[PDB]
Amino acid sequence: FAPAADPGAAWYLLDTSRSLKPLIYQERMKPSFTSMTKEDDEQV
Amino acid sequence: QFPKLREWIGQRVIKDMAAQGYQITNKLFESTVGVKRTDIEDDNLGVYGPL
């Protein structure tokens, strides 16, 4: 299917990740909003 | 003033206030009579001078 033979002990590995921004929780629940005013209090 | 409570917060409908005005002119009113200068002095009975 999707094989991948790779090393894991060299100084560098495959398919490196880039954790630039950690998980940040953004909430929009304040009244007078666009989605909560124009629509029926639709939170996001 | 503000109208009735509608039945939809979904897709709310905006409205506007109506500015009403009433204009009127305050024209004057008058009425007067003419009399003689001698007659008021030539009247010892007190009438013609309660004007």
Short mmCIF file of N, CA, C and O in Angstrom, two decimals:
data_model
loop_
_atom_site.label_atom_id
_atom_site.label_comp_id
_atom_site.label_asym_id
_atom_site.label_seq_id
_atom_site.Cartn_x
_atom_site.Cartn_y
_atom_site.Cartn_z
N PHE A 1 0.83 -1.20 0.00
CA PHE A 1 0.00 0.00 0.00
C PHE A 1 0.87 1.26 0.00
O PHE A 1 1.12 1.85 -1.05
N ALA A 2 1.33 1.66 1.18
CA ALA A 2 2.17 2.84 1.35
C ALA A 2 3.38 2.46 2.21
O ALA A 2 3.52 2.91 3.35
N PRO A 3 4.27 1.62 1.68
CA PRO A 3 5.44 1.21 2.44
C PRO A 3 6.42 2.35 2.64
O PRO A 3 6.45 3.33 1.89
N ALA A 4 7.24 2.22 3.69
CA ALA A 4 8.29 3.20 3.95
C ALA A 4 9.38 2.51 4.77
O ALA A 4 9.21 2.31 5.98
N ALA A 5 10.47 2.15 4.11
CA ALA A 5 11.66 1.63 4.79
C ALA A 5 12.57 2.81 5.11
O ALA A 5 13.07 3.48 4.20
N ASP A 6 12.79 3.05 6.39
CA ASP A 6 13.48 4.25 6.85
C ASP A 6 14.46 3.88 7.95
O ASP A 6 14.32 2.84 8.60
N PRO A 7 15.49 4.69 8.17
CA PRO A 7 16.29 4.57 9.39
C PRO A 7 15.67 5.36 10.53
O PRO A 7 14.80 6.22 10.34
N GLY A 8 16.13 5.05 11.74
CA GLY A 8 15.65 5.73 12.93
C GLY A 8 16.72 5.97 13.97
O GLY A 8 16.43 6.38 15.09
N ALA A 9 17.98 5.70 13.60
CA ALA A 9 19.10 5.87 14.51
C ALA A 9 20.15 6.86 14.00
O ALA A 9 21.06 7.21 14.77
N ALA A 10 20.06 7.31 12.76
CA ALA A 10 20.99 8.30 12.25
C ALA A 10 20.73 9.65 12.92
O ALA A 10 19.75 9.85 13.65
N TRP A 11 21.64 10.60 12.68
CA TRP A 11 21.51 11.92 13.27
C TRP A 11 20.23 12.62 12.83
O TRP A 11 19.78 13.54 13.52
N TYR A 12 19.63 12.20 11.72
CA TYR A 12 18.38 12.77 11.24
C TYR A 12 17.45 11.66 10.78
O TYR A 12 17.90 10.61 10.31
N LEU A 13 16.15 11.90 10.93
CA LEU A 13 15.11 10.95 10.58
C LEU A 13 14.32 11.47 9.37
O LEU A 13 14.57 12.56 8.85
N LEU A 14 13.35 10.67 8.93
CA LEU A 14 12.53 11.03 7.79
C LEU A 14 11.31 11.84 8.23
O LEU A 14 10.92 11.83 9.40
N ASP A 15 10.72 12.55 7.27
CA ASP A 15 9.43 13.21 7.45
C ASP A 15 9.39 13.99 8.77
O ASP A 15 8.52 13.78 9.62
N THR A 16 10.34 14.91 8.92
CA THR A 16 10.44 15.68 10.14
C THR A 16 9.22 16.59 10.32
O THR A 16 8.62 17.06 9.35
N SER A 17 8.87 16.83 11.58
CA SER A 17 7.79 17.73 11.94
C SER A 17 8.35 19.11 12.29
O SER A 17 9.53 19.27 12.58
N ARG A 18 7.47 20.11 12.24
CA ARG A 18 7.83 21.50 12.52
C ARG A 18 6.79 22.06 13.49
O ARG A 18 5.75 22.57 13.07
N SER A 19 7.09 21.98 14.79
CA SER A 19 6.18 22.46 15.83
C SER A 19 6.38 23.96 16.03
O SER A 19 6.85 24.44 17.06
N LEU A 20 6.00 24.72 14.99
CA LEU A 20 6.10 26.17 15.06
C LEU A 20 5.13 26.73 16.09
O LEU A 20 5.52 27.52 16.96
N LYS A 21 3.86 26.34 16.01
CA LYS A 21 2.81 26.86 16.88
C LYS A 21 2.21 25.71 17.68
O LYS A 21 1.65 24.77 17.09
N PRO A 22 2.29 25.72 19.01
CA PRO A 22 1.63 24.68 19.80
C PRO A 22 0.11 24.82 19.72
O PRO A 22 -0.43 25.79 19.21
N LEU A 23 -0.57 23.81 20.25
CA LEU A 23 -2.03 23.83 20.26
C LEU A 23 -2.52 25.04 21.04
O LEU A 23 -2.27 25.17 22.24
N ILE A 24 -3.21 25.94 20.34
CA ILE A 24 -3.74 27.17 20.92
C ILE A 24 -5.25 27.14 20.78
O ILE A 24 -5.77 26.96 19.68
N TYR A 25 -5.95 27.32 21.90
CA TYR A 25 -7.41 27.23 21.93
C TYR A 25 -7.99 28.63 21.76
O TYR A 25 -7.82 29.49 22.63
N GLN A 26 -8.68 28.85 20.64
CA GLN A 26 -9.33 30.12 20.35
C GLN A 26 -10.84 29.92 20.40
O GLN A 26 -11.37 29.02 19.74
N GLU A 27 -11.52 30.75 21.19
CA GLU A 27 -12.95 30.66 21.39
C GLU A 27 -13.62 31.97 21.01
O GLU A 27 -13.09 33.05 21.31
N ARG A 28 -14.78 31.87 20.36
CA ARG A 28 -15.57 33.03 19.95
C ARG A 28 -17.00 32.79 20.44
O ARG A 28 -17.84 32.29 19.70
N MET A 29 -17.26 33.17 21.69
CA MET A 29 -18.57 32.96 22.31
C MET A 29 -19.16 34.25 22.85
O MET A 29 -20.21 34.21 23.49
N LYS A 30 -18.52 35.39 22.60
CA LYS A 30 -19.03 36.65 23.11
C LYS A 30 -20.24 37.11 22.29
O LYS A 30 -20.29 36.89 21.08
N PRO A 31 -21.22 37.75 22.92
CA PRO A 31 -22.38 38.23 22.15
C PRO A 31 -21.98 39.34 21.19
O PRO A 31 -20.81 39.72 21.13
N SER A 32 -22.94 39.86 20.43
CA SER A 32 -22.69 40.93 19.47
C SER A 32 -21.76 40.49 18.35
O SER A 32 -21.18 41.33 17.65
N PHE A 33 -21.61 39.18 18.16
CA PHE A 33 -20.77 38.63 17.12
C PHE A 33 -21.53 38.61 15.79
O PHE A 33 -22.71 38.99 15.72
N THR A 34 -20.87 38.18 14.72
CA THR A 34 -21.54 38.07 13.43
C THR A 34 -22.37 36.79 13.36
O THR A 34 -23.56 36.83 13.01
N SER A 35 -21.77 35.65 13.70
CA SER A 35 -22.48 34.38 13.62
C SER A 35 -23.50 34.22 14.73
O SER A 35 -24.46 33.45 14.57
N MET A 36 -23.32 34.91 15.86
CA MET A 36 -24.30 34.85 16.93
C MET A 36 -25.39 35.90 16.80
O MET A 36 -26.45 35.75 17.42
N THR A 37 -25.16 36.96 16.02
CA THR A 37 -26.19 37.97 15.79
C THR A 37 -27.00 37.66 14.53
O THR A 37 -28.21 37.44 14.61
N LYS A 38 -26.33 37.62 13.37
CA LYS A 38 -27.06 37.40 12.13
C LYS A 38 -27.76 36.04 12.14
O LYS A 38 -28.92 35.93 11.73
N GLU A 39 -27.07 35.01 12.61
CA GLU A 39 -27.64 33.68 12.75
C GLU A 39 -28.08 33.48 14.20
O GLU A 39 -27.93 34.36 15.05
N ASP A 40 -28.62 32.30 14.49
CA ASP A 40 -29.22 32.02 15.79
C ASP A 40 -28.15 31.57 16.79
O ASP A 40 -28.00 30.39 17.11
N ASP A 41 -27.40 32.56 17.28
CA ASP A 41 -26.45 32.35 18.38
C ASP A 41 -25.46 31.23 18.07
O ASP A 41 -25.00 30.54 18.98
N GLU A 42 -25.12 31.05 16.80
CA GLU A 42 -24.24 29.96 16.40
C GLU A 42 -22.84 30.19 16.96
O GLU A 42 -22.14 31.11 16.52
N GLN A 43 -22.44 29.37 17.92
CA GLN A 43 -21.11 29.45 18.50
C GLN A 43 -20.09 28.76 17.60
O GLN A 43 -20.44 27.97 16.72
N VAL A 44 -18.82 29.06 17.83
CA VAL A 44 -17.72 28.43 17.12
C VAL A 44 -16.53 28.34 18.06
O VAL A 44 -16.34 29.19 18.93
N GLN B 1 -41.24 54.72 18.10
CA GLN B 1 -40.81 53.75 19.11
C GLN B 1 -40.43 52.45 18.40
O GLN B 1 -40.49 52.35 17.17
N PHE B 2 -40.04 51.46 19.20
CA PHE B 2 -39.56 50.16 18.76
C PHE B 2 -40.74 49.23 18.47
O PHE B 2 -41.73 49.24 19.20
N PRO B 3 -40.68 48.39 17.41
CA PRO B 3 -41.83 47.54 17.09
C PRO B 3 -41.85 46.24 17.89
O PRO B 3 -41.02 46.03 18.78
N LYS B 4 -42.80 45.37 17.57
CA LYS B 4 -43.00 44.14 18.33
C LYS B 4 -41.77 43.24 18.25
O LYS B 4 -40.94 43.35 17.35
N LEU B 5 -41.67 42.34 19.22
CA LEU B 5 -40.66 41.29 19.18
C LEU B 5 -41.00 40.32 18.06
O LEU B 5 -42.10 39.76 18.02
N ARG B 6 -40.05 40.11 17.15
CA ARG B 6 -40.25 39.22 16.02
C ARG B 6 -40.08 37.77 16.48
O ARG B 6 -40.04 37.48 17.68
N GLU B 7 -39.99 36.85 15.53
CA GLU B 7 -40.02 35.42 15.81
C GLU B 7 -38.82 34.70 15.21
O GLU B 7 -38.88 33.50 14.94
N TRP B 8 -37.71 35.42 14.99
CA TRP B 8 -36.54 34.81 14.35
C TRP B 8 -35.28 35.53 14.82
O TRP B 8 -35.07 36.69 14.48
N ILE B 9 -34.45 34.83 15.60
CA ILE B 9 -33.10 35.32 15.87
C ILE B 9 -32.15 34.83 14.79
O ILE B 9 -31.14 35.49 14.50
N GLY B 10 -32.42 33.68 14.19
CA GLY B 10 -31.75 33.32 12.96
C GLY B 10 -32.15 34.28 11.85
O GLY B 10 -33.32 34.64 11.71
N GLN B 11 -31.17 34.70 11.07
CA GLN B 11 -31.35 35.72 10.03
C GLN B 11 -32.19 36.88 10.56
O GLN B 11 -33.27 37.19 10.07
N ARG B 12 -31.66 37.53 11.60
CA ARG B 12 -32.33 38.69 12.17
C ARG B 12 -32.57 39.74 11.10
O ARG B 12 -31.79 39.90 10.16
N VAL B 13 -33.68 40.47 11.24
CA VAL B 13 -34.04 41.54 10.32
C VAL B 13 -33.85 42.86 11.04
O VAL B 13 -34.41 43.08 12.12
N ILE B 14 -33.06 43.74 10.45
CA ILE B 14 -32.82 45.07 11.00
C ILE B 14 -34.05 45.92 10.73
O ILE B 14 -34.90 45.55 9.91
N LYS B 15 -34.17 47.05 11.41
CA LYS B 15 -35.25 48.00 11.18
C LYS B 15 -34.71 49.40 11.44
O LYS B 15 -33.55 49.59 11.82
N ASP B 16 -35.56 50.40 11.22
CA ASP B 16 -35.18 51.80 11.39
C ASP B 16 -36.26 52.54 12.14
O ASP B 16 -37.44 52.18 12.09
N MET B 17 -35.85 53.59 12.85
CA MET B 17 -36.78 54.48 13.54
C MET B 17 -37.29 55.53 12.57
O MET B 17 -36.56 55.97 11.67
N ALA B 18 -38.54 55.94 12.75
CA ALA B 18 -39.18 56.93 11.90
C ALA B 18 -39.13 58.29 12.60
O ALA B 18 -39.65 58.43 13.71
N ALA B 19 -38.52 59.27 11.95
CA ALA B 19 -38.42 60.62 12.49
C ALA B 19 -39.64 61.41 12.03
O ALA B 19 -39.82 61.66 10.84
N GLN B 20 -40.47 61.81 12.99
CA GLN B 20 -41.69 62.55 12.72
C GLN B 20 -41.51 64.01 13.10
O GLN B 20 -40.75 64.35 14.02
N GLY B 21 -42.21 64.89 12.39
CA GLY B 21 -42.12 66.31 12.64
C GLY B 21 -43.45 66.99 12.41
O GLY B 21 -44.27 66.53 11.61
N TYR B 22 -43.66 68.10 13.11
CA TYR B 22 -44.88 68.89 12.99
C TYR B 22 -44.50 70.36 12.95
O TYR B 22 -43.85 70.86 13.88
N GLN B 23 -44.91 71.05 11.89
CA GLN B 23 -44.57 72.45 11.68
C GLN B 23 -45.83 73.31 11.77
O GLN B 23 -46.88 72.95 11.22
N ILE B 24 -45.73 74.43 12.48
CA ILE B 24 -46.84 75.35 12.66
C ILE B 24 -46.30 76.77 12.74
O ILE B 24 -45.22 77.01 13.29
N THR B 25 -47.05 77.72 12.18
CA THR B 25 -46.68 79.12 12.16
C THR B 25 -47.48 79.88 13.20
O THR B 25 -48.70 79.70 13.31
N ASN B 26 -46.80 80.73 13.98
CA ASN B 26 -47.44 81.47 15.06
C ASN B 26 -47.78 82.89 14.60
O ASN B 26 -47.20 83.88 15.04
N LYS B 27 -48.76 82.97 13.71
CA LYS B 27 -49.20 84.27 13.21
C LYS B 27 -49.88 85.06 14.32
O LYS B 27 -50.46 84.50 15.26
N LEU B 28 -49.80 86.39 14.21
CA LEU B 28 -50.28 87.28 15.25
C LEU B 28 -51.81 87.38 15.22
O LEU B 28 -52.48 86.94 14.28
N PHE B 29 -52.35 87.97 16.28
CA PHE B 29 -53.77 88.29 16.37
C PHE B 29 -53.91 89.67 16.99
O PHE B 29 -53.15 90.03 17.89
N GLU B 30 -54.88 90.44 16.51
CA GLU B 30 -55.02 91.83 16.94
C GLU B 30 -56.47 92.27 16.81
O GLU B 30 -57.27 91.66 16.09
N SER B 31 -56.79 93.34 17.53
CA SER B 31 -58.07 94.02 17.41
C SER B 31 -57.97 95.34 18.15
O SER B 31 -57.39 95.40 19.23
N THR B 32 -58.51 96.40 17.54
CA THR B 32 -58.37 97.73 18.10
C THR B 32 -59.52 98.60 17.62
O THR B 32 -60.22 98.26 16.66
N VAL B 33 -59.71 99.72 18.31
CA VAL B 33 -60.77 100.67 17.99
C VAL B 33 -60.21 102.08 18.03
O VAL B 33 -59.18 102.35 18.64
N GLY B 34 -60.91 102.99 17.35
CA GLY B 34 -60.54 104.39 17.31
C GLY B 34 -61.44 105.23 18.20
O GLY B 34 -62.63 104.96 18.35
N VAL B 35 -60.84 106.26 18.81
CA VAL B 35 -61.56 107.17 19.69
C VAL B 35 -60.97 108.56 19.53
O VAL B 35 -59.85 108.74 19.04
N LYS B 36 -61.73 109.57 19.95
CA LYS B 36 -61.31 110.96 19.89
C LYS B 36 -60.54 111.34 21.14
O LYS B 36 -60.78 110.82 22.23
N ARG B 37 -59.59 112.27 20.97
CA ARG B 37 -58.78 112.71 22.11
C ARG B 37 -59.58 113.59 23.05
O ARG B 37 -59.43 113.49 24.28
N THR B 38 -60.42 114.48 22.51
CA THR B 38 -61.19 115.38 23.36
C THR B 38 -62.27 114.63 24.12
O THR B 38 -62.55 114.94 25.28
N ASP B 39 -62.90 113.64 23.48
CA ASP B 39 -64.04 112.97 24.09
C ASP B 39 -63.64 112.24 25.37
O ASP B 39 -64.39 112.25 26.35
N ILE B 40 -62.47 111.59 25.38
CA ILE B 40 -62.05 110.89 26.59
C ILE B 40 -61.86 111.89 27.73
O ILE B 40 -62.21 111.61 28.89
N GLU B 41 -61.31 113.07 27.43
CA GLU B 41 -61.22 114.12 28.44
C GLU B 41 -62.57 114.77 28.69
O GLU B 41 -62.85 115.21 29.81
N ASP B 42 -63.42 114.85 27.66
CA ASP B 42 -64.77 115.39 27.80
C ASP B 42 -65.76 114.30 28.18
O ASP B 42 -66.79 114.11 27.53
N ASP B 43 -65.45 113.57 29.25
CA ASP B 43 -66.31 112.50 29.74
C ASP B 43 -66.07 112.38 31.24
O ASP B 43 -65.07 111.78 31.66
N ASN B 44 -66.96 112.96 32.03
CA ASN B 44 -66.81 113.00 33.48
C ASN B 44 -67.45 111.81 34.19
O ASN B 44 -67.35 111.71 35.41
N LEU B 45 -68.11 110.91 33.45
CA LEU B 45 -68.85 109.82 34.06
C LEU B 45 -68.05 108.53 34.17
O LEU B 45 -68.57 107.53 34.67
N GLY B 46 -66.80 108.52 33.71
CA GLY B 46 -65.93 107.37 33.85
C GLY B 46 -65.99 106.37 32.71
O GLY B 46 -65.08 105.54 32.60
N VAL B 47 -67.02 106.43 31.88
CA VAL B 47 -67.09 105.60 30.68
C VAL B 47 -66.18 106.22 29.63
O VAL B 47 -65.70 107.35 29.80
N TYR B 48 -65.92 105.49 28.55
CA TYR B 48 -65.11 106.01 27.45
C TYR B 48 -63.71 106.37 27.97
O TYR B 48 -63.31 107.54 28.04
N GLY B 49 -62.98 105.32 28.33
CA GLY B 49 -61.79 105.44 29.15
C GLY B 49 -61.54 104.22 30.02
O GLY B 49 -60.42 104.01 30.50
N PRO B 50 -62.56 103.40 30.25
CA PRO B 50 -62.31 102.00 30.62
C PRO B 50 -61.88 101.12 29.46
O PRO B 50 -61.83 99.90 29.60
N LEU B 51 -61.57 101.76 28.32
CA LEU B 51 -61.17 101.04 27.12
C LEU B 51 -59.92 100.22 27.37
O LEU B 51 -59.80 99.09 26.88
#
